[PDB]
Nucleic acid binder design. Structure first.
Length: 799
RNA sequence: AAUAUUAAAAA
């Protein structure tokens, strides 16, 4: 039961250059009628939704209970009809496989009430009415395609995008219905996800093992193959195709794996899989040296199995697979716009008989919305120049500029973990020469040559070397670590540097040492300066929100879930009034838990550090929360607002700073496109950085907005969505939109406006770093692993 | 790991 009401929208923004946009939201007209909600209970109880749908489809065809109605169904418990069914609780006995089915009336759901919420803004949006509409509009798609979350996919036709390792890309679309002012909106986007190829198990095995001289699998090969195929469904081909789920792969080859077979004589014998296939099916195995799949002592030789079609790949993709998939699926904004428009035409929503049954109509053109391009802030640099930077198309640079507070680097070391042959002494010297030149220009002078420069190999060499360095070189400020590509050395450098010894480290791939770029070296300096306590730039102070007239702390929070492994929570807090410098807190928690369990304590730590750093108690807390699943906003808000308040009260009983709580979401399918082709930016043709929308496609009365704060480089930009779930601070829409945009210009790792505010982005980096610190059991040990060293606690080690 | 953006997230 929600008790913290989200703020109503205080108004719409008026600041910024108007820009005409199109959104992939299509207006939906609904009849102002009652719809009838029935519960369906199917026994057996835990069949796949696709099986449940088959059952209800059978019943609807065979029991016209239903009359001439066309019910819609969610594949679970919920059926809806446009007029009442001629019943009171009805029990059915279906043979399609025998099912016991019961149906009973549950509710009347009002679309008149839904309409009233959308037009008047005087009542809550009735979620039960929205659900009925969502179910009706996706019913037919759910019968035709393969549903995956809120998307639909179908087998590749006319295209083929293998990812290697027995996986391929399927294209489809996302569909959702959302309330807006005046009308419901149908959100449609194209999508793509990885599925396992429908192919023989032997072929899947060869892809997974990178097999192009028949011999048994090595122990390594078998464990590898097992991890990939365990949990997948296979179908057999020797019986003319029964499906099974794979629970293991046998240690023994088919030639030697036995099971107990009872003979006619009553005696039970240990029969091998190969012998059994020969006698029972007259099947001589071609690969008896390969193991068997254990399914359901049921063992299947690999060669009688195929991977069942339509299985989405849930496991993480390799870097190559991920790169391949991004390539195959990237689309410019105008191309995506056309694909969506084309999809809508081919879909003919208005000709769907369920949509017709429920009197629904869908507009076939994208919704027009006038957005505004917010002004970008000016950044203030330091040095003798005291230069300013004026972002242009979301970007600026360091030319002629020096850091606001640049650190002088007097004592530094180099540790090269790439082989000396691939990174010679003269090459290291050219690298350091160029870096010192760039660092000087940036106002972060590296005074001399390194105190120490050594070659090493293997993760095991890191701690001995770093301990030596810490002990031998007083006042050591930095170790630059050269790495030979992707390596376990990185995780160990960060474990030892961040958690064990508390020493600043900056890693660099050998490829960027061998061939240097001024841009790459300049970017390295942005990180080094901040890691060593400096400030790269600040927002020009007089052009900020009035919240800066009193002490204010900005917090960013994120939660990361495992692909056993814990979930990781991270909260960062600003430590100055700029805001530029941040400190981080991080914890491990129960896997898949979405609420930040330890939020109160983490906030308390950050408030305490803010006081130490500034000598002020914050009178306002501005909290940007990333990682929140759609649908769970009320629950996360309830517990976390209380946890932030708890932190305050525990510091001092009457401490009640004004809290603004904002959810940041990039994982949605709202896309915005320039309506005037003339205003598109770059090759990708995206909306300009700063494009903001708070009308037409946003909530009918709550306080949410889209802001695409970044320049789109590739594909179609995702505009970040911001939901203001609490605001004690009385922000105007312009004020809070502008503040959010300015914070996207304070992110230290690049001279660009990034897609989410720096505090949220930092929390993401802190959580990701904890995953490296955890690279290697009991909960106590895991918690210790992510605790950074005392000398690291107060630093931006996550930059 | 210079960096942002970008797809997904019976036997």
């Amino acid at each position: 039961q929600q008790v913290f009401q989200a703020p109503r929208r205080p108004g719409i923004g008026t600041v910024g250059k108007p820009i005409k946009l199109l959104a992939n939201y299509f207006e939906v007209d609904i009849p102002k009628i009652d719809v009838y909600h029935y519960e369906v209970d199917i026994k057996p109880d835990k069949c796949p939704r696709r099986v449940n749908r088959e059952v209800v489809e059978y019943m609807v065809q065979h029991f016209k209970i239903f009359g001439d109605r066309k019910p819609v169904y969610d594949g679970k418990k919920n059926i809806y009809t446009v007029t009442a069914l001629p019943i009171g609780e009805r029990v059915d006995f279906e043979v399609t496989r025998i099912f016991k089915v019961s149906i009973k009336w549950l509710a009347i759901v009002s679309w008149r009430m839904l309409h009233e919420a959308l037009v008047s803004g005087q009542i809550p949006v009735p979620l039960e009415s929205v659900q009925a509409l969502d179910v009706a509009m996706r019913h037919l798609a759910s019968m035709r395609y393969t549903p995956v979350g809120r998307s639909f996919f179908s087998p590749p036709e006319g295209y083929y995008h293998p990812l290697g390792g027995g996986r391929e890309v399927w294209f489809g679309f996302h569909q959702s219905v959302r309330p807006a002012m005046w009308k419901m909106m149908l959100n449609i986007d194209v999508s793509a996800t990885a599925f396992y190829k429908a192919q023989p198990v032997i072929e899947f095995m060869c892809e997974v093992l990178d097999i192009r001289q028949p011999k048994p699998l090595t122990d390594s090969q078998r464990v590898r193959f097992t991890k990939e195929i365990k949990g997948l469904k296979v179908e057999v081909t020797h019986c003319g195709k029964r499906k099974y789920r794979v629970c293991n792969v046998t240690r023994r080859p088919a030639s030697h794996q036995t099971f107990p077979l009872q003979l006619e004589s009553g005696q039970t014998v240990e029969c091998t899989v190969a012998q059994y296939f020969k006698q029972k099916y007259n099947l001589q195995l071609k690969y008896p040296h390969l193991p068997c799949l254990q399914v359901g002592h049921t063992y299947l030789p690999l060669e009688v199995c195929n991977i069942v079609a339509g299985q989405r790949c849930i496991k993480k993709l390799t870097d190559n697979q991920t790169s391949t998939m991004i390539k195959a699926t990237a689309r410019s904004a105008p191309d995506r716009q056309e694909e969506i428009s084309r999809l809508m035409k081919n879909a003919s929503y208005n000709l769907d008989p369920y949509i017709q049954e429920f009197g629904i109509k869908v507009k076939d053109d994208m919704t027009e919305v006038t957005g505004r391009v917010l002004p970008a802030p000016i950044l203030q640099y330091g040095g003798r120049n005291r230069a300013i930077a004026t972002p242009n198309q979301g970007v600026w640079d360091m030319r002629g500029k020096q850091f606001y507070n640049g650190i002088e680097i007097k004592v530094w070391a180099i540790a090269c973990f790439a082989p000396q042959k691939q990174c010679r002494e003269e090459v290291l010297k050219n690298f350091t020469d160029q870096l010192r030149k760039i660092s000087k220009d940036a106002g972060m002078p590296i005074q001399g040559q390194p105190c120490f420069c050594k070659y090493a190999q293997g993760a095991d060499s890191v701690e001995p070397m770093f301990r030596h360095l810490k002990n031998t070189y007083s006042g050591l400020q930095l170790i630059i670590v050269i790495l030979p590509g992707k390596t376990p050395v990185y995780a160990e450098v960060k474990r030892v540097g961040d958690t064990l010894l508390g020493m600043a480290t900056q890693c660099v791939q050998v490829k960027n040492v061998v061939k240097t770029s001024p841009q790459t070296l300049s970017n390295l300096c942005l990180k080094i300066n901040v890691k060593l306590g400096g400030i790269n730039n600040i927002l020009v102070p007089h052009q900020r929100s009035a919240v800066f007239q009193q002490p204010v702390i900005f917090l960013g929070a994120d939660v990361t879930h495992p692909p056993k492994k814990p979930s990781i929570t991270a909260v960062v807090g600003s430590m100055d009034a700029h805001p530029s410098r941040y400190c981080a807190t991080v914890r491990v928690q129960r896997p898949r838990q979405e609420i930040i369990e330890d939020l109160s304590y983490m906030v308390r730590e950050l408030l305490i550090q803010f006081y130490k750093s500034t000598r002020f108690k914050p009178t306002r807390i501005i909290f940007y929360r990333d990682g929140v699943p759609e649908g769970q906003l009320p629950q996360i808000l309830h517990y976390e607002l209380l946890a932030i308040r708890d932190a305050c009260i525990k510091l001092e009983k009457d401490y009640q700073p004004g809290i603004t709580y904002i959810v940041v979401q990039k994982r949605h399918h709202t896309r915005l496109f320039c309506a005037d082709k003339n205003e598109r930016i770059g090759k990708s043709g995206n909306i300009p950085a700063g494009t903001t929308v708070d009308t037409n496609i946003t909530h009918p009365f709550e306080f949410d907005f889209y802001l695409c704060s970044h320049a789109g480089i590739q594909g179609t930009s995702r505009p970040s969505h911001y939901y203001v779930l609490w605001d004690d601070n009385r922000f105007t829409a312009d004020e809070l939109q502008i503040l959010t945009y300015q914070l996207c210009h304070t992110y230290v790792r690049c001279t660009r406006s990034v897609s989410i505010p720096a505090p949220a982005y930092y929390a993401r980096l802190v959580a990701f770093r904890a995953r490296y610190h955890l690279v290697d059991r009991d909960p106590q040990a895991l918690a210790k692993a992510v605790q950074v060293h005392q000398d690291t606690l107060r630093t931006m080690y996550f930059a």
